């Protein structure tokens with residue numbers, strides 16, 4: 001593998017007071033379910049399924065701007081555009097952006113980051 | 126040097142139907158111990174030790190393709206090629222690829238992603 | 251290729267801080283980062299926010315690694331052009347804080363990587 005592809009990374013808060021969750025495991029399950037829901041909805045329209053690897057985390061920023069002491073509970077979502085599944089990388093990028101905005105809405109987040117990083121994918125099967 | 130080098134990232138499932146681990150921390154230890162073993166075996170042959178930073182995760186894809194509701198338990202392994210230890214970036218890359226295939230086999234996975242990403246390493250010691 | 255992100259891998263020094271779980275180690279590192287980032291922001295108007303993840307780092311038992319890995323924390327953060335006017339000064343700030351983190355966590359060695367990234371920010 002010498003050609004390049006992309007990976008995305010999204011950082012989202014988990015809004016435990018709105019969703020009535022009380023643990024990292026509950027937040028991961030919630031984000032997993034929401035992502036599965038919206039990713040399937042977009043797959044049905046475009047044949048692009050943005051699968052995601054989601055990790056528990058906390059995000060540390062200024063207490064003045066709303067951060068709890070020691071950090072806000074967050075989830076990181078990351079995923080590669082696998083060339084075996086993705087014909088059109090620009091259409092995949094548009095789909096990730098669409099889903100990131102929808103995740104922001106579903107999670108009731110005020111702001112949200114979505115990054116694209118160049119990567120060289122070796123796929124073992 | 127400017128520290129221009131590579132990092133790798135692997136995403137592996139944990140085969141609960143095979144290992145019967147009963148928590149996220151047990152899955153982490155299971156993958157960590159396996160990685161520790163195969164990394165040492167390769168180091169004894171090549172003097173390349175691919176150390177790895179491992180994170181708990183859930184991977185979310187279409188339930189039609191076997192994904193449990195809210196995602197499958199996975200582990201993400203990431204590591205840099207530190208020029209302090211690595212003379213030859215291409216041999217390190219070939220070592221990572223060998224270990225990724227070996228991990229896929231030892232974890233009894235049908236597919237496994239292994240990505241290389243360009244990175245600028247600043248090493249403080 | 252619009253901007254940069256950093257990633258730092260830190261030990262948690264169980265023998266010094268006496269945390270009992272990965273949740274406590276995460277909070278310990280987070281609180282330390284929150285303080286040094288705030289103090290640097292007052293000086294330079296650059297606030298290096300960080301997304302921190304629990305982890306274990308696996309290396310050779312001959313070099314001190316516990317069986318199945320050492321408990322670690324990964325810190326990662328982007329330079330958001332809406333906040334950051336000077337990417338080189340942000341980079342210098344990240345390095346400054348990473349060294350200060352290494353000191354406060356009583357670590358012997360620490361990695362700090364920079365990766366090119368294209369940031370889309372939704373508000």
Ligand SMILES: Nc1ncnc2c1ncn2[C@@H]1O[C@H](CSCC[C@H](N)C(=O)O)[C@@H](O)[C@H]1O
Pocket residue numbers: 046047048049050051084085086087088186190
């Ligand atoms: N994220 C993903 N993970 C696993 N398999 C995927 C996938 N996205 C797509 N596939 C597989 O690819 C099939 C065809 S969808 C992709 C069609 C075409 N390559 C395109 O880019 O438009 C899916 O039904 C599924 O079998």
Ligand SMILES: Nc1ncnc2c1ncn2[C@@H]1O[C@H](CSCC[C@H](N)C(=O)O)[C@@H](O)[C@H]1O
Pocket residue numbers: 011012013014059060061062065072074108109110111112113299300301326327328
């Ligand atoms: N990718 C990233 N890198 C670094 N800091 C980030 C980040 N994404 C978010 N942050 C930090 O965390 C803050 C958001 S906290 C999570 C979002 C918030 N609950 C809301 O509703 O908007 C940002 O202001 C920034 O300081």
Ligand SMILES: Nc1ncnc2c1ncn2[C@@H]1O[C@H](CSCC[C@H](N)C(=O)O)[C@@H](O)[C@H]1O
Pocket residue numbers: 171172173174175176209210211212213309313
């Ligand atoms: N992943 C790793 N983490 C920490 N130390 C490592 C390491 N890999 C190698 N080392 C250190 O480097 C020593 C020499 S290994 C030979 C390295 C040589 N420059 C090459 O590229 O072939 C190891 O015994 C260990 O002390």
Ligand SMILES: Nc1ncnc2c1ncn2[C@@H]1O[C@H](CSCC[C@H](N)C(=O)O)[C@@H](O)[C@H]1O
Pocket residue numbers: 051052053078079080136137138139184185186187197199233234235236237238
């Ligand atoms: N790096 C990555 N980025 C995005 N999705 C990924 C991914 N790695 C795996 N996936 C998703 O997760 C699915 C695999 S689940 C993990 C492997 C499985 N247990 C097996 O034994 O084959 C992939 O088909 C894809 O949909």
Ligand SMILES: Nc1ncnc2c1ncn2[C@@H]1O[C@H](CSCC[C@H](N)C(=O)O)[C@@H](O)[C@H]1O
Pocket residue numbers: 061065294295296297298299332333334335336
């Ligand atoms: N890490 C961060 N996360 C979120 N907002 C941030 C931030 N760093 C700075 N800001 C935002 O930037 C505002 C002004 S400080 C930045 C001043 C100027 N752009 C400079 O480069 O010096 C803060 O009040 C806050 O709203």
Ligand SMILES: Nc1ncnc2c1ncn2[C@@H]1O[C@H](CSCC[C@H](N)C(=O)O)[C@@H](O)[C@H]1O
Pocket residue numbers: 176177178203204205259260261262307308309310313320322356357358359360361
């Ligand atoms: N970014 C990275 N990628 C891969 N391995 C890493 C790494 N950062 C650290 N390691 C591994 O973990 C070891 C450090 S363990 C954590 C630091 C230690 N507590 C100290 O105070 O020095 C390194 O020798 C290397 O083998």
